[PDB]
Ligand binder design. Sequence first.
Ligand SMILES: Nc1ncnc2c1ncn2[C@@H]1O[C@H](COP(=O)(O)OP(=O)(O)O)[C@@H](O)[C@H]1O
Ligand SMILES: [Ca+2]
Ligand SMILES: [Ca+2]
Length: 380
Amino acid sequence: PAVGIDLGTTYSCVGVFQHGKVEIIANDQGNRTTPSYVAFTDTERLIGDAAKNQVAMNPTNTVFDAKRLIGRRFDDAVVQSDMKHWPFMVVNDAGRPKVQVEYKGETKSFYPEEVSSMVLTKMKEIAEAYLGKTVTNAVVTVPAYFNDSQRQATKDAGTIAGLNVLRIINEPTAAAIAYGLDKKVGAERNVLIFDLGGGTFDVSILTIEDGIFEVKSTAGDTHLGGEDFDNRMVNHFIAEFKRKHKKDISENKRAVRRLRTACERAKRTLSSSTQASIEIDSLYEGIDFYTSITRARFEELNADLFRGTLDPVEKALRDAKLDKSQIHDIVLVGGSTRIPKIQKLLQDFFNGKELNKSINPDEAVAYGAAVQAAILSGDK
Ligand SMILES: Nc1ncnc2c1ncn2[C@@H]1O[C@H](COP(=O)(O)OP(=O)(O)O)[C@@H](O)[C@H]1O
Ligand SMILES: [Ca+2]
Ligand SMILES: [Ca+2]
């Protein structure tokens, strides 16, 4: 049994094509996505939810955003810029970046592909827990703009995890494969992939013909994601708590974290409901924080970030030399594309054109990866 693994910036997802359909596999916590987090404590190494859940208690030894480091050199401008936003240490080992942590009392360093191997190990175990069988063969996805060094380092992460990586394929290709846009009766198809995750915004235009997924353009923002929408909600409620209780909770890591968690949950709920409850017992000094937020307020807090996602779409179209009327298919992927206002903005931008969004947007890449894995293994 060959699996498809979406190794995302903030979440990872594993699917298997069996008996004519994709099954996206829930972890032992019942979650169909797993945080791309690894934590190092005085006793153990944690991966996924367990790692993310203890981040506020152990910030310096909790590693994330390994995908931003993978296949890069220490001196790279992107690495030096990104280090300013991480509580964990990034050190230079002979021109290569390593994350340095405390683990079982000792100072330890790990290459990005070692951190990612631990996430892939977790995704491997999630598939094996469900299938009741050893999982070796996998297709793993990377962004279209990833170079050979980034692709090789991602593949090596799989190998370190004991996975046989059949192929590294582009995330926008996986999304297009999921919706079967390569198997439509016709000539070429122009496809725009609108991919908004937790940390990154990726716009891709492919022209698909004779099984060739030609990248015509890429655009977006490597630092725009769902976490920015969460940030706007947290600042909103910190100001609110300040007004009501004359308490600034900003420098209480635990308090801010629990507010952030509640804010992300509320955001997810606002994609299906016009209102959401914030319910935190003893947020700060035993003071309960029970309030609500309307969809309207959430949209208002994030108005500039939401409509700003259309500028990269325009750029991608210009660089691809296509009018919006020449796009055959629009594909929503990444967890953030569930936000109704984002969906409305993109559909309005494409003058009413229906969006491909029937596949759970945060599962579509793993879905495509799993289809490709079955094809390569000869089980489809
Ligand atoms: N129903 C939802 N409504 C709004 N945002 C959501 C929803 N489900 C997930 N998200 C957001 O999607 C982001 C994760 O996107 P995903 O593609 O799964 O991860 P990655 O960041 O690794 O690409 C998070 O910010 C999460 O809060
Ligand atoms: Ca950001
Ligand atoms: Ca994603």
